[PDB]
């Protein structure tokens, strides 16, 4: 089952449809990954309303209650940077990917990829040839193969019956001229068979050049695939990578601060003169 | 309302067993954020491992298949980032509030921190030998302000007994008395309700300092956990940060490294050589 078995370039043509589902495949994947992006972002959002809440019915107030409260906002603007991800890997690269595909590859009128039948019908043509060459150089190995077996019969015929009782003058012919109808006929194909096989490495170089030619037109079309893959991998890349994005830094920076600005004296000054000794007092 | 309203100190000693809610609050928090950063990692593993098989069983091939494959493991190296904010959260930003709300709060088996009764009593205490002349005060208050009110009561009796049925002065000559004992009472109560008012400011500046004295007390105990909220949150911003990983920054190195290294010439090279014209072919 080598390239060059007649119909072995199946696997070639399979590479078109291949193609086309590959493009499925790796849409899917973004969009997977995607979906997960905007789950972590989501829970982000819920667990920051949902501690806001928290935090400002809860008896902390002052500066260290703001200081808690920043990390809310910092889960949010997590949030967003992860849905910006998702956009990213939506409305660019997936669309990206999906218009490639539509632009590649046609709808046959009966159904399939108009590339695929193009480069089916280019095997065939190129090979039709030296097939029917072939077809005939494989009916000419029966027609000889099936004598130098049935040579070994005139020749045991004559064996087996050359001891017996029964035989004449007539028996013992029909077993003579036998050994000739084989003899002077395996000759007689051992021609058919030694001819065809060299009427056929006489078009053996333009039944390669045929081949080569329908295959690099393959591999033209294989190659702009690999290229546009290779180009939206490099997209997706920079798309999921936030480890270079100043403004996710902004937001820790930011935090911190916030979680400085935390004075606890100042927040006791002020239980103090709200509700200590601090407060006015008219008395008796 | 004021704070020197006896018992008003109440709401300073709430704020003793508030202390421990929101170190418990600020606890499941953290966990529930914990969770948040696990899901989102164990959602990161699920895809990687999920397409490191669709690619591998898949008919993508070659540099092209690794710059695919590249990205599951970016997918499971952000994961580990990711378990590593929910292990830090968790063994160190948890399990440290967890210790010094416990060996801080001393729970009273019975029911009820030992550090509150500390002020509690310590309150009662110190507004003990206020609330005891306040009471004798008040009780010289509504005394009085009912001896002036017994007076014109019995005046109304005398002037007010003229246009009686023929006026016995065996009664007139004593019905006076009554209007005028009550005077005699007016003047005694009046000197009570007086004197200990008196009685009731030779005690406030040393009412108010007993009581400023536990004040304070209750004061440095909140400032121990307020300085914690702002020591405990400084660390947990830190954790969350992923910037403050190098490793970060070289998973999008490696990544983009990997897909640059695709190369579609080289890819398909090897396709001719493995399915194409570059096979080996045994011809009859
Ligand atoms: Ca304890
Ligand atoms: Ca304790």
Same mark, same amino acid.
């Given at each position: 089952?080598?390239?060059?078995?007649?119909?072995?370039?199946?696997?070639?043509?399979?590479?078109?449809?291949?193609?086309?589902?590959?493009?499925?495949?790796?849409?899917?994947?973004?969009?997977?990954?995607?979906?997960?992006? /905007? &789950?972590?972002?989501?829970?982000?959002? *819920?667990?920051?309303?949902?501690?806001?809440?928290?935090? =400002? %019915?809860?008896? $902390?107030?002052?500066?260290?209650?703001?200081?808690?409260?920043?990390?809310?906002?910092?889960?949010?603007?997590?949030?967003?940077?992860?849905?910006?991800?998702?956009?990213?890997?939506?409305?660019?690269?997936?669309?990206?990917?999906?218009?490639?595909?539509?632009?590649?590859?046609?709808?046959?009128?009966?159904?399939?990829?108009?590339?695929?039948?193009?480069?089916?019908?280019?095997?065939?043509?190129?090979?039709?040839?030296?097939?029917?060459?072939?077809?005939?150089?494989?009916?000419?190995?029966?027609?000889?193969?099936?004598?130098?077996?049935?040579?070994?019969?005139?020749?045991?015929?004559?064996?087996?019956? /050359? &001891?017996?009782?029964?035989?004449?003058? *007539?028996?013992?012919?029909?077993?003579?001229?036998?050994? =000739? %109808?084989?003899? $002077?006929?395996?000759?007689?194909?051992?021609?058919?068979?030694?001819?065809?096989?060299?009427?056929?490495?006489?078009?053996?170089?333009?039944?390669?050049?045929?081949?080569?030619?329908?295959?690099?037109?393959?591999?033209?079309?294989?190659?702009?695939?690999?290229?546009?893959?290779?180009?939206?991998?490099?997209?997706?890349?920079?798309?999921?990578?936030?480890?270079?994005?100043?403004?996710?830094?902004?937001?820790?920076?930011?935090?911190?601060?916030?979680?400085?600005?935390?004075?606890?004296?100042?927040?006791?000054?002020?239980?103090?003169?709200?509700?200590?000794?601090?407060?006015?007092?008219?008395?008796?």
């Amino acid at each position: 089952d080598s390239f060059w078995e007649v119909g072995n370039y199946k696997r070639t043509v399979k590479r078109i449809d291949d193609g086309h589902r590959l493009c499925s495949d790796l849409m899917n994947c973004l969009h997977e990954r995607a979906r997960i992006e /905007k &789950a972590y972002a989501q829970q982000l959002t *819920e667990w920051a309303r949902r501690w806001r809440q928290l935090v =400002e %019915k809860g008896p $902390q107030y002052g500066t260290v209650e703001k200081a808690w409260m920043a990390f809310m906002s910092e889960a949010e603007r997590v949030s967003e940077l992860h849905l910006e991800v998702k956009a990213s890997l939506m409305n660019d690269d997936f669309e990206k990917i999906k218009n490639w595909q539509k632009e590649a590859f046609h709808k046959q009128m009966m159904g399939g990829f108009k590339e695929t039948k193009e480069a089916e019908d280019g095997f065939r043509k190129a090979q039709k040839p030296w097939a029917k060459k072939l077809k005939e150089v494989e009916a000419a190995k029966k027609a000889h193969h099936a004598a130098c077996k049935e040579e070994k019969l005139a020749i045991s015929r004559e064996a087996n019956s /050359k &001891a017996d009782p029964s035989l004449n003058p *007539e028996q013992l012919k029909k077993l003579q001229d036998k050994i =000739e %109808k084989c003899k $002077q006929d395996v000759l007689k194909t051992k021609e058919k068979y030694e001819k065809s096989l060299k009427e056929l490495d006489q078009g053996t170089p333009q039944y390669m050049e045929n081949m080569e030619q329908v295959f690099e037109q393959c591999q033209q079309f294989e190659e702009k695939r690999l290229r546009f893959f290779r180009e939206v991998l490099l997209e997706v890349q920079k798309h999921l990578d936030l480890s270079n994005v100043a403004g996710y830094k902004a937001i820790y920076h930011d935090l911190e601060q916030s979680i400085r600005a935390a004075d606890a004296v100042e927040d006791l000054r002020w239980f103090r003169a709200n509700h200590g000794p601090g407060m006015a007092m008219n008395w008796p």
